[PDB]
Amino acid sequence: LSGLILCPVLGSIILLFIPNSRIRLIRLIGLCASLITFLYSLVLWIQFDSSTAKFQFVESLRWLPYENINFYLGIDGISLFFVILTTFLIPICILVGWSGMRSYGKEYIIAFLICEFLMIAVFCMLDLLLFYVFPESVLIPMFIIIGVWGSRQRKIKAAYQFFLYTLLGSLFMLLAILLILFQTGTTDLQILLTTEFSERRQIFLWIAFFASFAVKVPMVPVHIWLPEAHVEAPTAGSVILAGILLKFGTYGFLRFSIPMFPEATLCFTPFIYTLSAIAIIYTSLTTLRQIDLKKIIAYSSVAHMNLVTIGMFSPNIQGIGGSILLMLSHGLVSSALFLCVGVLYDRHKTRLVRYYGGLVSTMPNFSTIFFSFTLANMSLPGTSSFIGEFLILVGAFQRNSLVATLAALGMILGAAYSLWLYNRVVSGNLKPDFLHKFSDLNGREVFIFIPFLVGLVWMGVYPKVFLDCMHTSVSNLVQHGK
């Protein structure tokens, strides 16, 4: 990993010295740098050994001498394919932008502000202080991606009181991170694993992490930032948001909640149970109220992510496997649906949803692919999302199956409204006022669709290569939770 780690930063910076009004070169070379960092992510996958509690390719550089809070970079188990999904998806955003001129949307600026692999950092960052810096850090890139080239639906903004609470929750986690950091000098995640805290304080520290996380996670009391953040997000800002920025909260719980505070997690199991359950119920019923397509997909994403939560709780190896594989399948499916709804916007240039009609005439291949992914967002058994969600379900393994009975409503209403909305979008010869402008999909368009469908099917028919490469790590996490 030593050299092949910093591909996106090197690429971005050495392209910053190429303003190059003639876009062809910046597009080509940024895309090549992204694709080669993805290639090195994938060869790093191939490099994996599914047999160690240690982290696969550890590296560091002194960051502050005393207590050495340094860039500790591990990729065991989950992070392995989290960074893989990150890379998998970043060329997708670079490729959804072969727009010809791309002038006001200055192409090199979006290249340089999507080609920041701080997501790679955080998923490999294995000392929760610097790990803290990155999800909060990616907000500066996310904010510029969300509105600079993002569609303007309102005076671009986020609920100000909610945003203040969201960042306050993030900084509340920071106080908890410091309390553990000075609690026993424990710099990094290996030693924060080894150490043992006061049960009276483990619960406080757990909920303090949980503040920021359950903001990043879309739980019922605070999740509103996803719809408002997406309906304004650009086509490639949503692909990243759904893809990774939601995985942030669940991976945070996975690494720095379950094997960190085993007693606090034991104590708060019913809390997250009910939270995620009622969140899934709400976000299943809501798309009744929401007619906005981006809000629809964002709420389906909330549902899936709170399923990821209702599964990560468990010492069930199947439980957390279903959690992380619902994460992978979600970063595939919701991002593929955001790709879909972005194509559906642009090809129609309209931001009402009642206006997407006669799709089987305009773009019938888009109808086929939109089904190929909406069956997934409802988790058709056979798809990747099915393996994910059902290992989430069997996560009631040592349990007594009372939260699966709330996932009942959460997923039945989800699949129901998934089908309702796929109909509502493709229904009828509802002639729109587009002046016979059909907008058939592009070869590059079906290309950027290719990898999501491929990952989806390759998981849904063969989840081994992902459950393997993971079981050793998750099982170590579980025994530390034992």
């Binding site: 047999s51 509690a53 080894t194 150490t195 043992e196 099982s475 170590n476 579980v478 025994q479």
Partner: protein
């Protein structure tokens, strides 16, 4: 795929030896998977019993299948 059953030196109180405490985790989970795969091998052997009989295909192994199941306890 070459590990050792001894976990070095870990007493019951595990705060003392973080090296040995991590090693007990990493190889007692190896033992966890030992007996999990033992249950899985005995399950493939339950399928093997069924394959063999084909006419009883419940009996002549069912109490031995209960022995198989005794790899798991506390069913309540």
């Amino acid at each position: 795929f070459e590990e050792s059953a001894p976990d070095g030196f870990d007493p019951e109180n595990p705060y003392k030896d973080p090296v040995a405490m991590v090693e007990m985790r990493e190889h007692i989970v190896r033992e966890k998977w030992i007996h999990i795969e033992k249950a899985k091998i005995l399950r493939e052997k339950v399928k093997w019993c069924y394959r063999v009989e084909g006419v009883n295909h419940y009996q002549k192994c069912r109490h031995l299948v209960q022995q198989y199941l005794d790899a798991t306890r506390g069913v309540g």
